Symmetry: D4
């Protein structure tokens, strides 16, 4: 049963959001990966978000670009933590994505990650760190992940 | 009597800006309603408002919000009516967050966006009037009178006041 | 007889504005598609805008890039609704286009759409939603368009 | 009694913003500690604070700083706990330097970033509460009550006051 | 006596900025006219002003506007005279909208653009003077005197006043 | 004898500044085209600018990118009109170039044109419009240029 | 007694910012001179100042200016000494024009750039001190004491004052 | 024994930081070139910076991109001068890198250079100018470098 939902506005967003999917798989976190469009499927979004907690989801990772409303509107309909990934847009390079996700008025939060693939990977890692608070086996796997990441950095660059 | 434009805004704070749209529609004798609808705090209210707007006889929606401003776009997601968006000026980023949040709609769901702040609220009312005037000759005449007076009221030279 | 006029500053703008043309054609909205340069053909612009209403146009869609003055100056000369499309510029990625179109002082409006092809498509859709207020057959075709757009969004991404 | 959230900030000046996180955690009855930790002036204090946070029983860290804002990211470098970042508004660049310094973490070390300023501090507390509520039914009920009251307190229309 | 520079601006509000151009041309004894011409509210006035400027004996036009600032560019579209543009500072975007609206003219129709605000108005007058001085030896001498005094008036060290 | 000097910081700037050179040649305006680096050849710059008027130059067109100081420092040393062309920089797309040229404090002006090739072409046209005030034959050629530019704009785009 | 750092600035207005560099060098007992040099109004003064700095015994130059800020870069063009640049905050663009004008030096002629405003002036003095301390053990000790006290003066928790 | 340390967050940063390495080599300045990640190897960073002075380093050049914390955190742990190079990031073109390096609060300085390769070259040259204050042979080589740079600028561009 999935405990993280990864949602994104379109197939084009998957080039970015696949990095969240891959990370959750590496850490053996059960998850679902879906397309939900805030603008084209607003009722699908409302249903997805309002039923997420009763379906057993613990965290939602939502990615969108441009006037990026998917994470904020998801958070409007769920008390679950919602993490937002700004997808890089063609013209404004994700600055529109970033501001339309992070600048939520007080009362409905979205935890926002970096523009692009780094943000997708980090949304998955942040979801993992949330789940690790209550899952000791996962906490150990996350500590192994962080230890390997630290230990694997080379000491000098190659030409 | 029945409203043909709906003005919606995220908050009482937003009304400092959106009141200019309200006032201008009244000046042009366009029946309208003026409401608070919060995209984030009242999302079900928004869905219901937008999806029933056409059947209630509304022709245009003017929506204003600031920051991560989702109200105009999500309204447009649920109505086939034209939606006009006013970016309300935000404290830190001066409405640039508001502007990009509203204007950068992906293809398929439009929001016609006006200037940041009071200028945009005034112009949203005027753009709504322009839309309605296509089918309403009396309003078209009032709008033409408005534009003519606006043009006639521009002086030829500025006033110097060194005091 | 055309009821929407699509105008643009140059041939180079057509790579963007063709998306408005295509959408109007799909919805069977009679329209004209023309080049009008605010800076190189200012008298052509004045004549086009001032005669638009008497020629039977209902909406003007105007696209331009850089210091983009075509939509605003069109609106100066007509009481018709004018919709502006910021064309992506090479250096500043349409941010110059966007600010020079959207930041109209009160008194002369331009309804502005997104930078680039999305904005061109959406200007056509916004024009359609305006015309649909008075044309029941078009209103039904626009509702079919929106219904198909909603229904066609996949539920999950493909690898 | 023992804290489960740590709120850390770079300076007393930052507390004008971060006090909103402190107040909201108290309202939701979430035990927490509220501290000054300077990334640049007390880097060893930061390393020790972050690396011992989990063993001390903390579950979430909320970190706020402005300008070249390194406190949230460097905290995240030393803890496996979720770190939430609040960009404190800076004088010249209005928190844009704060925001980019915090949110643009390269892949591998996350900071969940909230809005510039007081809005972000309030929302960092609410996001922390959302995280804790996953395992705490009493808190989940308090959070649901909070959201319900927030929704119920939005009026239907704005107030006009021309004075 | 007859004007050789025309200073045009979109509004009375713009004159708070453009008055500095007016004052500096007077100081340099350059005959000029100072007018309000609105690109959006008086577009026919603008077309007539620009297309007749050369035949009326004008040599340079200085045009100032803010926001979506179209006055300098549209003036340049209708005259072969050099047009200098002053971006007037706007409230929300601090004249960045004004600046990009004026300076980013596509190839074929130039506007020589000066700094945002009063600095740009002063420098538009000085640039106009530089242009006119090419053909007017008396003015060239006055301009050289101006620059010499400006240089001579810079002190060697600053003043400390802790009070 | 040259009456316009086109100067630029480096060979790399010539990809942009060649458009000024071409325009002046088309209009038969005698000119010189040179490399002068504000940062690498500051004494060359001082000498060039301070002697420009006595050498018979009427206008200087100066192009530079990044922290672009060439136009402003030229204007510091000459009473001639100085026109500045922001060269597009790799990272910041000429926004650094633009702000470092246009934002001159009052007292020493630089008339600034658009980022990139458009700005180079327009600096040449603006120089031509300055020279045309005193040269009737050139004024007629400039009016022909503007008339041809206006007349040559197509009425509709090609697919 | 003889100065080893030169602080130069474009104007008296700039001294509101650059005075912080002056004060901090005095606190660290670093002999220095503090001058106004205008890149645009006194370009020959600048050339002479920069080209003679090394022979006069200066080791570091701290230069501050705003807007289209050319003073640090042109100083660096004429001296082989390290030049540190302080972007002075500008009115409209909040020092972003100052910052990009100073930091974006093409390869070959460096300016070590500090933060916009007073923070940058303080840090230019500290960076100059760090450079001088490489060869001056007494100054190195004073700088180490400064950093130690700075660290020791950071409290563990903030002060709440609801009044 | 190295007197300059060049450090960078990752192998990917070396495409930029190699230009600092090359310049120091040209000027015969002994140096070390290393990878140190502020986020993945924070203890490596603390150790590197705190021991730098006792190891005989005089200047540290630190390059990083995105949320770029390496230079500032290095400066937190050393009294040596720290020079920061903003590495160009994919989405925001190094503007995130630049602001996260240059905007240091008073008390802990980082001398910041341009975004990208120019900044890396200039960090090396600025380090050289610092070392030249105390090393007469190096001062002469740096003056030769600057003289050659000045003398080598062409007088006119090539087509
Ligand atoms: K009058
Ligand atoms: K009520
Ligand atoms: K004096
Ligand atoms: K204490």
């Amino acid at each position: 049963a999935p405990v993280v939902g990864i949602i994104m506005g379109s197939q084009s967003d998957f080039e970015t959001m696949r990095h969240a999917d891959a990370l959750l798989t590496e850490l053996e976190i059960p998850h679902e990966t879906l397309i939900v469009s805030a603008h084209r499927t607003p009722d699908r979004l409302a249903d997805y978000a309002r039923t997420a907690a009763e379906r057993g989801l613990n965290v939602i990772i939502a990615g969108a670009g441009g006037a990026a409303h998917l994470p904020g509107m998801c958070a409007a309909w769920t008390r679950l933590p919602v993490l937002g990934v700004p997808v890089e847009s063609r013209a404004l390079k994700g600055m529109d994505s970033l501001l339309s996700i992070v600048q939520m008025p007080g009362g409905v939060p979205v935890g926002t990650l970096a523009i692009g693939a780094s943000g997708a990977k980090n949304a998955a890692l942040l979801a993992a760190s949330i789940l690790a608070l209550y899952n000791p086996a996962l906490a150990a796997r996350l500590e192994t992940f962080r230890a390997l990441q630290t230990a694997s950095v080379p000491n000098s660059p190659i030409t």
